Structure 1
């Protein structure tokens, strides 16, 4: 979720994770990816 994503060093994005990050979980009721 958003809380764990952000607290653990990630960001919530709806579409693509930028280069040198990867999908690790989700945010916003699962509609977005947590990119770390």
Structure 2
């Protein structure tokens, strides 16, 4: 979820995770990626 994503040092994105990060969870009712 967004809270845990950001508090665990990730970023919520709908787009592909940017270079040097990868998907670790979701945000926004499942519709976005947690990228770290």
Q: Which TM class, normalised by the smaller chain length?
A: over 0.9
- TM-score (norm: length of structure 1): 0.96
RMSD between aligned alpha carbons?
A: 0.4
Residues paired across the two proteins, number = 36
Q: List gaps (5 residues or longer) in structure 1.
A: none
Name segments (4+ residues, structure 1) moved above 6 Å.
none
Unaligned 5+ runs, structure 2: none
Under a length normalisation based on structure 2, what TM-score does the superposition of the two structures give?
0.96
